[model samples]
Target: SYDIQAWKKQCEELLNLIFQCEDSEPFRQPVDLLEYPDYRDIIDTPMDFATVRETLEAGNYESPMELCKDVRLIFSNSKAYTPSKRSRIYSMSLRLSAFFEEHISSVLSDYKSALRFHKRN
Candidate 1:
Protein backbone atom coordinates (compact mmCIF):
# COMPACT_ATOMS: atom_id res chain seq x y z
CA SER A 1 0.00 0.00 0.00
CA TYR A 2 2.97 2.33 0.52
CA ASP A 3 6.05 2.94 -1.59
CA ILE A 4 8.66 4.77 0.44
CA GLN A 5 11.36 4.33 -2.17
CA ALA A 6 9.15 5.63 -4.93
CA TRP A 7 8.18 8.59 -2.82
CA LYS A 8 11.83 9.41 -2.16
CA LYS A 9 12.59 9.24 -5.87
CA GLN A 10 9.69 11.51 -6.63
CA CYS A 11 10.73 14.00 -3.98
CA GLU A 12 14.28 14.11 -5.27
CA GLU A 13 13.06 14.59 -8.81
CA LEU A 14 10.83 17.44 -7.71
CA LEU A 15 13.69 19.14 -5.89
CA ASN A 16 15.96 18.71 -8.87
CA LEU A 17 13.37 20.19 -11.18
CA ILE A 18 12.64 23.08 -8.86
CA PHE A 19 16.34 23.80 -8.39
CA GLN A 20 16.94 23.37 -12.13
CA CYS A 21 19.71 20.92 -11.33
CA GLU A 22 18.03 18.54 -13.74
CA ASP A 23 16.55 19.45 -17.10
CA SER A 24 13.21 17.86 -16.28
CA GLU A 25 10.79 20.73 -16.79
CA PRO A 26 9.90 20.88 -20.46
CA PHE A 27 8.86 24.48 -20.06
CA ARG A 28 12.14 25.35 -18.41
CA GLN A 29 15.25 26.23 -20.39
CA PRO A 30 18.85 26.66 -19.33
CA VAL A 31 18.96 30.28 -18.15
CA ASP A 32 20.54 32.60 -15.63
CA LEU A 33 17.08 33.29 -14.26
CA LEU A 34 15.49 29.88 -14.36
CA GLU A 35 12.46 30.49 -12.16
CA TYR A 36 11.57 33.85 -13.71
CA PRO A 37 9.11 33.50 -16.58
CA ASP A 38 10.75 36.42 -18.38
CA TYR A 39 14.29 35.01 -18.47
CA ARG A 40 13.94 31.26 -18.65
CA ASP A 41 16.05 30.96 -21.78
CA ILE A 42 19.03 32.92 -20.50
CA ILE A 43 21.29 30.24 -19.12
CA ASP A 44 23.59 31.39 -16.29
CA THR A 45 21.22 34.28 -15.71
CA PRO A 46 19.84 33.72 -12.21
CA MET A 47 17.03 31.78 -10.54
CA ASP A 48 13.74 33.60 -9.95
CA PHE A 49 10.65 33.10 -7.77
CA ALA A 50 10.12 29.38 -8.36
CA THR A 51 13.80 28.74 -7.94
CA VAL A 52 13.94 30.85 -4.77
CA ARG A 53 10.97 28.95 -3.38
CA GLU A 54 12.78 25.70 -4.02
CA THR A 55 15.99 26.88 -2.39
CA LEU A 56 14.16 28.30 0.61
CA GLU A 57 12.24 25.08 1.07
CA ALA A 58 15.61 23.42 0.86
CA GLY A 59 16.75 25.73 3.76
CA ASN A 60 18.35 28.76 2.15
CA TYR A 61 17.27 32.36 1.56
CA GLU A 62 19.33 33.53 -1.39
CA SER A 63 16.83 36.22 -2.30
CA PRO A 64 16.71 39.24 -0.04
CA MET A 65 13.47 40.41 -1.60
CA GLU A 66 11.64 37.21 -0.82
CA LEU A 67 13.15 37.14 2.63
CA CYS A 68 12.00 40.67 3.32
CA LYS A 69 8.49 39.95 2.07
CA ASP A 70 8.30 36.79 4.14
CA VAL A 71 9.44 38.59 7.27
CA ARG A 72 7.04 41.47 6.68
CA LEU A 73 4.06 39.20 6.10
CA ILE A 74 4.80 37.06 9.10
CA PHE A 75 5.53 39.94 11.43
CA SER A 76 2.59 41.97 10.22
CA ASN A 77 0.23 39.05 10.67
CA SER A 78 1.67 37.50 13.75
CA LYS A 79 -1.46 38.24 15.75
CA ALA A 80 -3.79 36.49 13.29
CA TYR A 81 -2.01 33.15 12.93
CA THR A 82 -4.20 31.61 10.18
CA PRO A 83 -4.39 33.12 6.69
CA SER A 84 -8.10 33.80 6.72
CA LYS A 85 -7.85 35.59 10.04
CA ARG A 86 -4.77 37.44 8.80
CA SER A 87 -6.25 38.74 5.59
CA ARG A 88 -6.98 42.08 7.26
CA ILE A 89 -3.36 42.58 8.15
CA TYR A 90 -2.32 41.40 4.72
CA SER A 91 -4.37 44.03 2.93
CA MET A 92 -3.44 46.76 5.38
CA SER A 93 0.24 45.98 5.06
CA LEU A 94 0.02 46.21 1.30
CA ARG A 95 -1.57 49.62 1.52
CA LEU A 96 0.81 50.83 4.19
CA SER A 97 3.85 49.67 2.26
CA ALA A 98 2.54 51.38 -0.85
CA PHE A 99 1.79 54.56 1.04
CA PHE A 100 5.23 54.63 2.57
CA GLU A 101 6.92 54.10 -0.75
CA GLU A 102 4.78 56.61 -2.59
CA HIS A 103 5.15 59.36 0.00
CA ILE A 104 8.73 58.53 0.94
CA SER A 105 7.60 58.54 4.55
CA SER A 106 10.22 57.75 7.09
CA VAL A 107 9.42 55.23 9.78
CA LEU A 108 7.56 56.91 12.70
CA SER A 109 7.29 60.14 10.72
CA ASP A 110 3.52 59.92 10.68
CA TYR A 111 3.12 57.20 13.24
CA LYS A 112 0.62 58.77 15.61
CA SER A 113 -1.60 60.35 12.94
CA ALA A 114 -1.50 57.24 10.78
CA LEU A 115 -2.41 54.96 13.64
CA ARG A 116 -5.27 57.21 14.69
CA PHE A 117 -6.56 57.43 11.14
CA HIS A 118 -6.53 53.68 10.65
CA LYS A 119 -8.04 53.11 14.06
CA ARG A 120 -10.74 55.68 13.56
CA ASN A 121 -11.51 54.55 10.03
Candidate 2:
Protein backbone atom coordinates (compact mmCIF):
# COMPACT_ATOMS: atom_id res chain seq x y z
CA SER A 1 0.00 0.00 0.00
CA TYR A 2 2.68 2.50 0.98
CA ASP A 3 4.79 1.33 -1.91
CA ILE A 4 1.94 1.99 -4.28
CA GLN A 5 1.58 5.54 -3.03
CA ALA A 6 5.28 6.13 -3.52
CA TRP A 7 5.11 4.72 -7.01
CA LYS A 8 2.12 6.83 -7.86
CA LYS A 9 3.99 9.94 -6.78
CA GLN A 10 7.00 8.89 -8.83
CA CYS A 11 4.82 8.30 -11.86
CA GLU A 12 3.13 11.64 -11.49
CA GLU A 13 6.46 13.38 -11.17
CA LEU A 14 7.79 11.66 -14.26
CA LEU A 15 4.73 12.60 -16.22
CA ASN A 16 5.04 16.21 -15.15
CA LEU A 17 8.67 16.23 -16.16
CA ILE A 18 7.96 14.73 -19.58
CA PHE A 19 4.95 16.89 -20.28
CA GLN A 20 6.62 20.07 -19.00
CA CYS A 21 3.21 21.01 -17.72
CA GLU A 22 2.45 22.17 -14.23
CA ASP A 23 -0.97 21.29 -12.88
CA SER A 24 -0.72 24.19 -10.46
CA GLU A 25 -0.38 27.46 -12.41
CA PRO A 26 -3.64 26.69 -14.04
CA PHE A 27 -4.94 25.38 -10.73
CA ARG A 28 -6.05 21.89 -11.76
CA GLN A 29 -5.90 22.53 -15.50
CA PRO A 30 -3.65 19.94 -17.11
CA VAL A 31 -2.56 21.91 -20.13
CA ASP A 32 -0.21 24.82 -19.81
CA LEU A 33 0.23 27.82 -22.16
CA LEU A 34 -3.36 27.41 -23.24
CA GLU A 35 -5.39 30.57 -22.82
CA TYR A 36 -8.65 29.02 -21.65
CA PRO A 37 -9.70 31.88 -19.39
CA ASP A 38 -13.28 32.67 -20.30
CA TYR A 39 -13.13 33.23 -24.03
CA ARG A 40 -16.60 34.42 -24.92
CA ASP A 41 -18.61 34.55 -28.15
CA ILE A 42 -17.47 31.02 -28.90
CA ILE A 43 -20.31 28.92 -30.21
CA ASP A 44 -19.02 25.76 -28.51
CA THR A 45 -16.01 24.39 -26.63
CA PRO A 46 -14.76 21.44 -24.59
CA MET A 47 -15.21 22.01 -20.92
CA ASP A 48 -12.04 22.19 -18.83
CA PHE A 49 -11.82 20.39 -15.48
CA ALA A 50 -12.98 23.40 -13.49
CA THR A 51 -16.33 23.42 -15.21
CA VAL A 52 -16.56 19.67 -15.35
CA ARG A 53 -15.77 19.07 -11.68
CA GLU A 54 -18.07 21.77 -10.42
CA THR A 55 -20.99 20.59 -12.50
CA LEU A 56 -20.33 16.97 -11.67
CA GLU A 57 -20.29 17.83 -7.98
CA ALA A 58 -23.53 19.75 -8.35
CA GLY A 59 -25.16 16.77 -10.14
CA ASN A 60 -25.45 18.88 -13.30
CA TYR A 61 -23.78 16.65 -15.85
CA GLU A 62 -26.20 17.54 -18.60
CA SER A 63 -24.59 20.85 -19.50
CA PRO A 64 -20.99 19.71 -19.12
CA MET A 65 -21.49 16.43 -20.99
CA GLU A 66 -23.27 18.33 -23.73
CA LEU A 67 -20.08 20.29 -24.28
CA CYS A 68 -17.84 17.22 -23.98
CA LYS A 69 -20.04 15.39 -26.51
CA ASP A 70 -19.96 18.34 -28.86
CA VAL A 71 -16.18 18.52 -28.77
CA ARG A 72 -15.78 14.76 -29.22
CA LEU A 73 -18.14 14.82 -32.17
CA ILE A 74 -16.25 17.64 -33.85
CA PHE A 75 -12.85 16.03 -33.32
CA SER A 76 -14.09 12.59 -34.37
CA ASN A 77 -14.47 13.53 -38.06
CA SER A 78 -11.07 15.17 -38.28
CA LYS A 79 -8.17 13.71 -40.22
CA ALA A 80 -5.05 12.62 -38.35
CA TYR A 81 -2.95 15.67 -37.90
CA THR A 82 0.40 15.90 -35.86
CA PRO A 83 1.49 12.39 -36.92
CA SER A 84 -0.29 10.74 -33.94
CA LYS A 85 2.79 10.34 -31.77
CA ARG A 86 1.39 11.01 -28.32
CA SER A 87 1.33 14.69 -27.55
CA ARG A 88 2.51 15.22 -23.97
CA ILE A 89 0.07 18.01 -23.33
CA TYR A 90 -2.80 15.91 -24.56
CA SER A 91 -1.59 12.92 -22.59
CA MET A 92 -1.35 14.97 -19.43
CA SER A 93 -4.78 16.43 -19.97
CA LEU A 94 -6.39 13.04 -20.43
CA ARG A 95 -4.59 11.34 -17.57
CA LEU A 96 -5.38 14.13 -15.18
CA SER A 97 -9.00 13.93 -16.22
CA ALA A 98 -9.10 10.21 -15.55
CA PHE A 99 -7.55 10.70 -12.12
CA PHE A 100 -10.03 13.36 -11.20
CA GLU A 101 -13.02 11.43 -12.48
CA GLU A 102 -12.10 8.27 -10.59
CA HIS A 103 -11.35 10.07 -7.34
CA ILE A 104 -14.44 12.27 -7.49
CA SER A 105 -16.69 9.32 -8.19
CA SER A 106 -15.22 7.45 -5.29
CA VAL A 107 -15.57 10.40 -2.93
CA LEU A 108 -19.25 10.79 -3.71
CA SER A 109 -20.22 7.15 -3.98
CA ASP A 110 -21.32 6.88 -0.34
CA TYR A 111 -23.86 8.90 1.58
CA LYS A 112 -26.12 8.89 4.65
CA SER A 113 -29.85 9.49 4.43
CA ALA A 114 -31.40 12.50 6.11
CA LEU A 115 -34.87 13.32 7.32
CA ARG A 116 -36.43 16.47 8.76
CA PHE A 117 -39.86 17.46 10.02
CA HIS A 118 -41.41 20.73 11.11
CA LYS A 119 -43.43 20.90 14.34
CA ARG A 120 -45.95 23.47 15.44
CA ASN A 121 -45.28 25.25 18.75
Candidate 3:
Protein backbone atom coordinates (compact mmCIF):
# COMPACT_ATOMS: atom_id res chain seq x y z
CA SER A 1 0.00 0.00 0.00
CA TYR A 2 2.93 2.30 0.62
CA ASP A 3 4.90 1.46 -2.50
CA ILE A 4 5.03 5.08 -3.58
CA GLN A 5 6.58 6.21 -0.29
CA ALA A 6 9.27 3.54 -0.37
CA TRP A 7 10.08 4.20 -4.00
CA LYS A 8 10.25 7.93 -3.36
CA LYS A 9 12.75 7.45 -0.52
CA GLN A 10 15.03 5.36 -2.68
CA CYS A 11 14.79 7.79 -5.58
CA GLU A 12 15.61 10.71 -3.32
CA GLU A 13 18.73 8.91 -2.07
CA LEU A 14 19.87 8.10 -5.61
CA LEU A 15 19.43 11.71 -6.65
CA ASN A 16 21.43 12.83 -3.62
CA LEU A 17 24.40 10.63 -4.60
CA ILE A 18 24.27 11.86 -8.18
CA PHE A 19 24.16 15.53 -7.16
CA GLN A 20 26.98 15.02 -4.65
CA CYS A 21 29.23 13.85 -7.47
CA GLU A 22 28.04 16.75 -9.58
CA ASP A 23 29.26 19.25 -7.03
CA SER A 24 32.80 17.80 -7.03
CA GLU A 25 33.63 18.54 -10.66
CA PRO A 26 34.92 22.04 -11.37
CA PHE A 27 34.10 23.68 -14.69
CA ARG A 28 36.77 24.39 -17.30
CA GLN A 29 34.56 26.92 -19.05
CA PRO A 30 31.65 28.59 -17.37
CA VAL A 31 28.36 29.03 -19.20
CA ASP A 32 25.74 31.68 -18.46
CA LEU A 33 22.96 30.11 -20.49
CA LEU A 34 20.85 29.00 -17.56
CA GLU A 35 21.22 32.20 -15.61
CA TYR A 36 20.07 34.48 -18.39
CA PRO A 37 16.93 36.49 -17.71
CA ASP A 38 15.33 35.29 -20.92
CA TYR A 39 15.28 31.68 -19.75
CA ARG A 40 14.16 32.19 -16.20
CA ASP A 41 10.52 31.24 -16.59
CA ILE A 42 11.19 28.41 -19.02
CA ILE A 43 14.14 26.82 -17.29
CA ASP A 44 13.58 25.03 -14.02
CA THR A 45 15.53 22.61 -11.86
CA PRO A 46 14.55 19.27 -10.32
CA MET A 47 13.80 20.90 -6.98
CA ASP A 48 11.50 23.28 -8.83
CA PHE A 49 9.58 20.36 -10.24
CA ALA A 50 9.34 18.76 -6.81
CA THR A 51 8.06 22.00 -5.32
CA VAL A 52 5.43 22.34 -8.03
CA ARG A 53 4.23 18.80 -7.43
CA GLU A 54 4.26 19.29 -3.69
CA THR A 55 2.31 22.52 -3.90
CA LEU A 56 -0.39 21.03 -6.05
CA GLU A 57 -0.69 17.93 -3.90
CA ALA A 58 -0.84 20.00 -0.74
CA GLY A 59 -3.71 22.07 -2.08
CA ASN A 60 -5.62 19.05 -3.39
CA TYR A 61 -5.14 20.44 -6.87
CA GLU A 62 -4.69 17.88 -9.59
CA SER A 63 -2.56 19.26 -12.40
CA PRO A 64 -3.10 17.81 -15.81
CA MET A 65 -0.57 15.40 -17.29
CA GLU A 66 0.11 17.92 -20.06
CA LEU A 67 1.55 20.34 -17.52
CA CYS A 68 4.11 17.75 -16.48
CA LYS A 69 4.83 16.83 -20.08
CA ASP A 70 5.43 20.45 -21.04
CA VAL A 71 7.88 20.97 -18.21
CA ARG A 72 9.80 17.89 -19.25
CA LEU A 73 9.94 19.16 -22.80
CA ILE A 74 11.42 22.43 -21.62
CA PHE A 75 14.27 20.68 -19.82
CA SER A 76 14.84 18.28 -22.67
CA ASN A 77 15.21 21.17 -25.04
CA SER A 78 18.02 22.58 -22.90
CA LYS A 79 20.08 19.39 -22.77
CA ALA A 80 22.32 19.94 -25.77
CA TYR A 81 24.99 22.56 -25.17
CA THR A 82 28.53 23.53 -26.21
CA PRO A 83 31.19 20.85 -25.66
CA SER A 84 32.81 22.37 -22.59
CA LYS A 85 33.02 21.49 -18.91
CA ARG A 86 30.34 23.95 -17.80
CA SER A 87 28.11 23.09 -20.69
CA ARG A 88 28.38 19.51 -19.57
CA ILE A 89 27.19 20.52 -16.13
CA TYR A 90 24.24 22.38 -17.60
CA SER A 91 23.47 19.39 -19.75
CA MET A 92 23.60 17.05 -16.80
CA SER A 93 21.42 19.31 -14.70
CA LEU A 94 18.82 19.61 -17.43
CA ARG A 95 18.87 15.89 -18.08
CA LEU A 96 18.51 15.16 -14.39
CA SER A 97 15.51 17.42 -14.18
CA ALA A 98 13.92 15.53 -17.04
CA PHE A 99 14.76 12.24 -15.38
CA PHE A 100 13.27 13.39 -12.12
CA GLU A 101 10.06 14.35 -13.87
CA GLU A 102 10.05 11.09 -15.78
CA HIS A 103 10.41 8.91 -12.70
CA ILE A 104 8.78 10.92 -9.92
CA SER A 105 5.90 12.43 -11.85
CA SER A 106 5.11 9.12 -13.50
CA VAL A 107 4.75 7.46 -10.13
CA LEU A 108 2.31 10.06 -8.92
CA SER A 109 0.41 9.57 -12.16
CA ASP A 110 0.30 5.82 -11.62
CA TYR A 111 -0.78 6.33 -8.06
CA LYS A 112 -3.58 8.58 -9.17
CA SER A 113 -4.64 6.07 -11.79
CA ALA A 114 -4.64 3.30 -9.21
CA LEU A 115 -6.91 5.32 -7.01
CA ARG A 116 -9.26 5.95 -9.87
CA PHE A 117 -9.31 2.29 -10.76
CA HIS A 118 -10.00 1.29 -7.18
CA LYS A 119 -12.81 3.77 -6.88
CA ARG A 120 -14.48 2.45 -10.02
CA ASN A 121 -14.09 -1.15 -8.95
Candidate 4:
Protein backbone atom coordinates (compact mmCIF):
# COMPACT_ATOMS: atom_id res chain seq x y z
CA SER A 1 0.00 0.00 0.00
CA TYR A 2 2.91 2.35 0.71
CA ASP A 3 5.03 1.26 -2.26
CA ILE A 4 5.10 4.80 -3.53
CA GLN A 5 6.88 6.09 -0.46
CA ALA A 6 9.55 3.40 -0.40
CA TRP A 7 10.24 3.47 -4.10
CA LYS A 8 10.46 7.24 -4.01
CA LYS A 9 13.12 7.02 -1.37
CA GLN A 10 15.11 4.64 -3.55
CA CYS A 11 14.81 6.95 -6.55
CA GLU A 12 16.02 9.99 -4.64
CA GLU A 13 19.11 8.07 -3.52
CA LEU A 14 19.78 6.80 -7.03
CA LEU A 15 19.57 10.30 -8.49
CA ASN A 16 21.88 11.66 -5.81
CA LEU A 17 24.53 9.10 -6.71
CA ILE A 18 24.18 9.93 -10.39
CA PHE A 19 24.56 13.61 -9.67
CA GLN A 20 27.92 12.85 -8.13
CA CYS A 21 29.31 10.87 -11.05
CA GLU A 22 32.29 12.65 -12.65
CA ASP A 23 31.34 12.01 -16.29
CA SER A 24 27.83 13.27 -15.66
CA GLU A 25 28.76 16.86 -16.51
CA PRO A 26 27.28 17.27 -19.99
CA PHE A 27 23.98 15.81 -18.96
CA ARG A 28 23.45 18.23 -16.11
CA GLN A 29 21.65 20.68 -18.35
CA PRO A 30 19.84 20.68 -21.63
CA VAL A 31 22.07 20.83 -24.69
CA ASP A 32 22.23 24.43 -25.85
CA LEU A 33 20.87 24.82 -29.38
CA LEU A 34 23.46 27.49 -30.16
CA GLU A 35 26.22 25.07 -29.28
CA TYR A 36 24.86 22.29 -31.45
CA PRO A 37 22.39 23.60 -34.00
CA ASP A 38 21.98 20.32 -35.85
CA TYR A 39 21.28 18.53 -32.57
CA ARG A 40 17.60 19.16 -33.03
CA ASP A 41 17.81 18.13 -36.65
CA ILE A 42 19.20 14.69 -35.92
CA ILE A 43 17.88 13.90 -32.46
CA ASP A 44 14.17 13.15 -32.25
CA THR A 45 14.02 13.90 -28.51
CA PRO A 46 16.13 15.29 -25.73
CA MET A 47 16.44 15.01 -21.96
CA ASP A 48 18.75 16.17 -19.17
CA PHE A 49 19.22 16.44 -15.43
CA ALA A 50 17.16 19.59 -15.02
CA THR A 51 14.32 18.17 -17.08
CA VAL A 52 14.28 14.92 -15.11
CA ARG A 53 14.49 16.80 -11.84
CA GLU A 54 11.58 19.03 -12.78
CA THR A 55 9.53 16.08 -13.93
CA LEU A 56 10.21 14.25 -10.67
CA GLU A 57 9.43 17.32 -8.59
CA ALA A 58 6.15 17.70 -10.43
CA GLY A 59 5.19 14.18 -9.27
CA ASN A 60 5.00 12.78 -12.77
CA TYR A 61 6.73 9.42 -12.37
CA GLU A 62 4.48 6.55 -11.41
CA SER A 63 6.96 3.71 -11.87
CA PRO A 64 10.70 3.18 -11.63
CA MET A 65 10.63 1.81 -15.18
CA GLU A 66 9.20 5.05 -16.54
CA LEU A 67 11.46 7.22 -14.43
CA CYS A 68 14.74 5.48 -15.40
CA LYS A 69 13.77 5.32 -19.06
CA ASP A 70 13.52 9.11 -19.08
CA VAL A 71 16.83 9.32 -17.24
CA ARG A 72 18.37 7.10 -19.95
CA LEU A 73 17.02 9.59 -22.48
CA ILE A 74 19.81 11.86 -21.40
CA PHE A 75 22.29 9.11 -22.24
CA SER A 76 20.60 8.04 -25.47
CA ASN A 77 20.75 11.56 -26.85
CA SER A 78 24.50 11.56 -26.38
CA LYS A 79 24.88 8.10 -27.86
CA ALA A 80 23.01 9.04 -31.04
CA TYR A 81 24.64 12.41 -31.52
CA THR A 82 28.28 11.60 -30.92
CA PRO A 83 30.32 10.83 -34.01
CA SER A 84 32.04 7.64 -32.87
CA LYS A 85 33.14 5.39 -30.03
CA ARG A 86 36.14 7.70 -29.55
CA SER A 87 33.87 10.59 -28.60
CA ARG A 88 34.00 11.45 -24.90
CA ILE A 89 30.30 12.04 -24.54
CA TYR A 90 29.48 8.75 -26.22
CA SER A 91 31.60 6.60 -23.89
CA MET A 92 30.65 8.63 -20.86
CA SER A 93 27.00 8.07 -21.60
CA LEU A 94 27.63 4.34 -21.85
CA ARG A 95 29.27 4.28 -18.43
CA LEU A 96 26.50 6.32 -16.88
CA SER A 97 23.86 4.07 -18.41
CA ALA A 98 25.52 0.98 -16.98
CA PHE A 99 25.91 2.61 -13.59
CA PHE A 100 22.23 3.44 -13.31
CA GLU A 101 21.05 0.06 -14.52
CA GLU A 102 23.35 -1.74 -12.08
CA HIS A 103 22.37 0.37 -9.11
CA ILE A 104 18.67 0.40 -9.89
CA SER A 105 18.51 -3.30 -10.60
CA SER A 106 20.40 -4.18 -7.43
CA VAL A 107 17.92 -2.10 -5.50
CA LEU A 108 14.98 -3.59 -7.35
CA SER A 109 14.75 -6.37 -4.85
CA ASP A 110 14.42 -3.90 -2.01
CA TYR A 111 11.79 -1.96 -3.89
CA LYS A 112 9.83 -5.13 -4.43
CA SER A 113 10.27 -6.11 -0.82
CA ALA A 114 8.84 -2.79 0.16
CA LEU A 115 5.89 -3.43 -2.07
CA ARG A 116 5.21 -6.89 -0.74
CA PHE A 117 5.94 -5.81 2.81
CA HIS A 118 3.42 -3.04 2.54
CA LYS A 119 0.92 -5.58 1.43
CA ARG A 120 1.36 -6.94 4.93
CA ASN A 121 0.45 -3.50 6.18
lDDT (CA) per prediction: 0.37, 0.35, 0.46, 0.79
Higher-TM-score candidate of 1 and 4: 4
Model 4 agreement with the true structure over 5-48: per-residue lDDT tens digits: 66666778778888899878889887788999899988898888
Off by over 4 Å in 3: 2-47, 50-60, 63-67, 70-74, 77-86, 105-109
Estimate, for each residue in 37-120, the C-alpha lDDT of model 3 and write its tens digit: 454354443223444334444543343443455345534545533244467656665556655656566556665676666687
After TM-score superposition, what is the CA distance of residue 30 in candidate 3 from its true location, in Å? 18
Q: Per-residue lDDT tens digits of candidate 1, residues 1-121?
A: 1221232233334334434432223213223344445432322233233553454567565333333354234224322332464465345445443532443223223443444565674
**Model 2 / residue 13 / CA error / Å:** 21
Q: Residue 61 in model 1: shift from native, Å?
A: 1.6
Ranking by TM-score: 4, 3, 2, 1
Candidate 4, residue 12: Cα displacement in angstroms equals: 1.0
Tens digit per residue, CA lDDT, model 2, 9-109: 33234334423435322323332224544323332333343443454445554332243453243233121222244755444445554554454332222
Ranking by lDDT: 4, 3, 1, 2
Displacement of residue 116 (Cα, Å) in model 3 is: 3.7
User: For residue 67, what is the lDDT in candidate 1?
Assistant: 38
List TM-score per model, in order: 0.20, 0.32, 0.39, 0.84
Q: Kindly report the root-mean-square deviation of model 1 from the true structure over all alpha carbons.
A: 19.3
User: How high is the lDDT of residue 13 in model 3?
Assistant: 52
| Least well predicted 10-residue stretch by lDDT in candidate 2 | 111-120
Worst 10 residues of 3 by lDDT: 22-31
